Structures are given as C-alpha cells and as structure tokens.
Amino acid sequence: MIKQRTLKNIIRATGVGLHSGEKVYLTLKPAPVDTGIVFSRTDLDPVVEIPARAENVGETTMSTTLVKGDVKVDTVEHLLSAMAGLGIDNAYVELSASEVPIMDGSAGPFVFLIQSAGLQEQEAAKKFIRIKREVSVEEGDKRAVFVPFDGFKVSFEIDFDHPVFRGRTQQASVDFSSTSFVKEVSRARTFGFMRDIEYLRSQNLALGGSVENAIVVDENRVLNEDGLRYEDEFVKHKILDAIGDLYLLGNSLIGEFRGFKSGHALNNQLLRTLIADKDAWEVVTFEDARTAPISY
Ligand SMILES: Nc1ccc(C#CC#Cc2ccc(C(=O)N[C@H](C(=O)NO)[C@@H](O)c3ccc(O)cc3)cc2)cc1
Ligand SMILES: [Zn+2]
Ligand SMILES: [Zn+2]
C-alpha cells in the first residue's frame, strides 16, 4: 500500500516574517498517523495549536493565514507547498511568532528542511481526495477550478499587461507524472510590483521584505540583478502558492487545479466550496502502489 508519511527527525530553522519583519524560530517535528499538519504557537501561554485545514483560514489581504480566535499563523502557503510536494501527511510545526519565516521567498528552503529531517513511512494507508466532478468559483475575472484528472496536475494563467510581463509565457500546466515538484517548482520565488510593495511599506507592512526574499519588478523591468531561477518563474510561483493552499484540504489530491488570476482568497473559497459538496469528491487509498496515478 501507499503509506502515510512523516518526518524521521526534528529539524529547525530561523528567519524573518515577510509581513511583520519579526525574527521567528521554526521547528518541524514528526507526528502520529492521521494528525495532518498542525501549527503550534509555542511563544504563547498556553500554547495554541491550529490544524492546517481549510476551515481555519481567516480573511487577510495578503498570504494564507490560519486563525483560532485572536491567534494567527500568517504566510503558511510556501511551507505547506513543500509539505504537499514531498507528500508529508503528518507533522507538527512550532513557531515562536505569528508568521512563518519567508526564507528566500520560495518553497526551496522548506523542501531542504524536510529532506534533511528524513522521510518516515508510517503503518497506515495514505488517503487521497479524488475530484469526481468539476467545481469552480469566481470573483470578477478571477477563476479557480477543480477538474477531474487521473493524476495530479496544476495549471495556472496570470494576465499582467504591464510592459515587464509583455512576451512572457504567463501560463503553465504541470503534470506531476513527469515534472519534479522539487527541481522544477519549489524554487520559484515570490514576487511583487514595486508600486504595491511601496504601498505596503508605507503602511509599515512588508517589513521583512528584501532583495534576498522576493523578486521585485517595476512597470518595465525585473529589478533583481541576477534574473530568474526559471524562465517562467512568476507563474511557477503561482503554482507553488496553489499547491500550498490546496494542501489545506488535509490530503493529497487526485485531480487538476486550474487557476486564472487566482489568489489565496479564491483558492480557499474553492476548497470550502468543494468540501461542502460530497458528490464532487471522494477519499481513496491504494493497497497496490502500482495501480496509483500518482507516486511519492
Ligand atoms: N531593498 C528592498 C528590496 C525588496 C524589498 C521588498 C519586498 C517585498 C514583498 C512582497 C510582499 C507581498 C508578496 C505577496 O504576497 N506575493 C504573493 C505570494 O507569493 N503569496 O504567497 C503572490 O502570489 C502575488 C500576489 C499578487 C501579486 O500582484 C503578485 C504576486 C510578495 C512580495 C524591500 C526592500
Ligand atoms: Zn502597468
Ligand atoms: Zn507565494
């Protein structure tokens, strides 16, 4: 059977929150079968735990934020993308502050941490959510869709008209049958438009942002001197973001996500909308890994 996966060892890193600029200690720990990913604010007394599930996502302008009462864990999407990409079912994530460290702006550092902790197979069948019927949500010209697919595929299109984006692909469709999440998706850095980052900074936000953790573009050019890690790094980061947000379903997906100018809010709306309709999905396991449309 395809087994559930956790970490072999506890592993740690430090960084700063992108939004808050606050130094934060991060700890990844093994967890028992059927735990899922659970965040813990260990700085608080008592310690507050928030399961990484769609229903616990709050309403914020930027990034995916988990909430329980007045307690938050901000910017969970890149770490969760790495967890999803490596097929980690169960883990505890301890944080000393209200935001996951931004690291280099990609999922790469979290992939590195997870790999370094080691991968531990557990004695229980891994559960998958299979999309049975197409479900969609929209807001203006933004659209997010789950489509049935015998495998795992993430497609995304952005639609920027600014000169800096002219001629760029702005679209990608990744079938993970033949694409490596680690090598071809995980290192895509977050990005922002200079005018928008200026606005955030004027409000004392984006305090942790720097040339070391984000690609900055103005209307006409990429400002980062070194260029891009992938030729289509921008849309690849949107795909990274979607994979992280989708992991709030609590299980790996058998299906396709299609995003059109979508973001964290719409991604979460899609999850809640899918979850509510039991005719549109089912939970499956694989007693024979060879008969599975995916592999970790
Ligand atoms: N010297 C110096 C140099 C640089 C800086 C800086 C900075 C910064 C920044 C920043 C802020 C917010 C985002 C952001 O939310 N990006 C989206 C994202 O990846 N979410 O996970 C992403 O999905 C997104 C969402 C909307 C959009 O229009 C573009 C990208 C990213 C980056 C300060 C000083
Ligand atoms: Zn423009
Ligand atoms: Zn992102």
Contacts of 287 (CB under 8 A, 6+ apart): 1, 125
> Do 223 and 217 form a contact (C-beta atoms < 8 A)?
yes
- Rounded to an integer, what distance in angstroms lies between the CA atom of residue 291 and that of residue 233? 33
Data resolution in angstroms: 1.6
- Rounded to an integer, what distance in angstroms lies between the CA atom of residue 200 and that of residue 113? 30
The ranges assigned to domains in the chain are: 1-127, 128-296
SS3 60: coil
Report which DSSP code applies to 287.
S
Tell which CATH classification among 3.90.25.10, 3.40.718.10, 3.30.230.20, 3.40.50.150 matches the domain 1-127. 3.30.230.20
Contacts of 218 (CB under 8 A, 6+ apart): 164, 193, 194, 195
Q: How far is CA 15 from CA 46, 77, 101, in A?
A: 24, 16, 5
C-alpha torsion angle, residues 253, 229, 235, 63 (rounded to 10): 70
> Do 101 and 14 form a contact (C-beta atoms < 8 A)?
yes
Ligand 1 atom closest to 19 (CA): 11
Report which DSSP code applies to 118.
-
Two tokens, residue 15: 């960084």
Select from 93, 84, 85 the least CA-distant residue to 251.
84
Give yes or no: 19 in active site: no
- φ/ψ of residue 109, rounded to 5: -60, -35
Cβ–ligand 1 contact at 60 (below 6 Å): no
Cβ–ligand 1 contact at 256 (below 6 Å): no
Enumerate the H helices of 53-107 as residue ranges: 77-85
> Do 210 and 47 form a contact (C-beta atoms < 8 A)?
no
Contacts of 89 (CB under 8 A, 6+ apart): 4, 5, 6, 33, 35, 36, 122, 126, 127, 251
- CATH code of 128-296, in short, is 3.30.1700.10
Method: X-ray
Count of beta carbons in the 10 Å neighbourhood of residue 138: 14
Select from 261, 292, 247, 230 the least CA-distant residue to 79.
247
